[PDB]
Design a protein around this ligand. Structure first.
Ligand code: 3Q5
Length: 279
């Protein structure tokens, strides 16, 4: 079928910077013809080539095109000019989950349960497509205007059929084997649940090396104020042996994870249609 013609920079009014890395910048843009807002990721070709990032850029475009689920930032279009590639992404107006953790300190049980359930439901979808995120963290779990999650940042994803993520959420197997699997994302999930409840990531230290040391030793502990059922769930995700994490294939997948007592009151069928709890 015929699709709309390529967009170009002049079709947009660019605004504020939404996010930044050493190889790309995400900028809010309003499409003039439609008044729609997009988060446009701008990548300078020369720099990407120079630093050998072509496979990562290609990976993100491929992944984010293929995903069709409300809990994921969508890639709507791409275009380029002489110097730059542009990716038109969903604009998640409320920004990072990290911002909310910092703002409110830690989440109550109702909010922890709901947002954890959305993240689990997103991973079920992603893993069902044979894709591993590999760098899941509250910085790339965004919140849309309606306060549902939208997960982004897929250049480092792996597609089943090399790279080490953010220190605090790195799984032990990446430190001891250099090998990621679906279960690496479930480890990150365990860290994120811990952070929602405690207000801080479970493996913390003065520098990267010391964090990694704690991870491989499973050296962390729970505060006294930690929802007991949430603690049990986290203990079943933060497991050194990757084949023993709740939710992984060797543990028979998402059924037993979603059945965990922490999720008792959750209706998994239509989370996106439910109204999120007030933070
Ligand atoms: C962290 C941020 C900058 C570095 C970048 N790293 C990169 O491009 O690495 C390469 C190697 C070049 C591939 C990953 N990046 C992002 C950022 C966002 C994003 C951010 C805020 C948003 C909002 N408010 N609405 N929508 C949003 C989408 N979305 C994607 N997909 N990526």
């Amino acid at each position: 079928p015929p699709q709309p013609r390529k967009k170009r920079p002049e079709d947009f009014k660019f605004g504020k910077i939404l996010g930044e890395g050493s190889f790309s910048t995400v900028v809010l843009a309003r499409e003039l013809a439609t008044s729609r807002e997009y988060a446009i990721k701008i990548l300078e070709k020369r720099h990407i080539i120079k630093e050998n990032k072509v496979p990562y850029v290609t990976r993100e475009r491929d992944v984010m095109s293929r995903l069709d689920h409300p809990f994921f930032v969508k890639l709507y279009f791409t275009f380029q000019d002489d110097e730059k590639l542009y990716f038109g992404l969903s604009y998640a107006k409320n920004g990072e989950l990290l911002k909310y953790i910092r703002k409110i300190g830690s989440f109550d049980e109702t909010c922890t349960r709901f947002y954890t359930a959305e993240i689990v439901s997103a991973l079920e979808y992603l893993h069902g497509k044979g894709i591993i995120h590999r760098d899941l963290k509250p910085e790339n779990i965004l919140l849309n205007e309606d306060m549902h999650i939208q997960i982004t940042d897929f250049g480092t994803a792996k597609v089943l059929s090399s790279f080490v993520g953010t220190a605090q959420y790195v799984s032990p197997e990446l430190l001891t084997e250099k090998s990621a699997c679906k279960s690496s994302d479930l480890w990150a999930l365990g860290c994120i649940i811990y952070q929602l409840v405690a207000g801080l990531p479970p493996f913390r230290a003065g520098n990267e090396y010391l964090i990694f040391q704690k991870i491989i030793k499973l050296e962390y502990d729970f505060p006294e104020k930690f929802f007991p059922k949430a603690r049990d769930l986290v203990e079943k995700l933060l497991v050194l042996d990757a084949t023993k994490r709740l939710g992984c294939e060797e543990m028979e997948g998402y059924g037993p994870l979603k059945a965990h007592p922490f999720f008792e009151s959750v209706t998994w069928e239509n989370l996106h249609q439910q109204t999120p709890p007030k933070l």
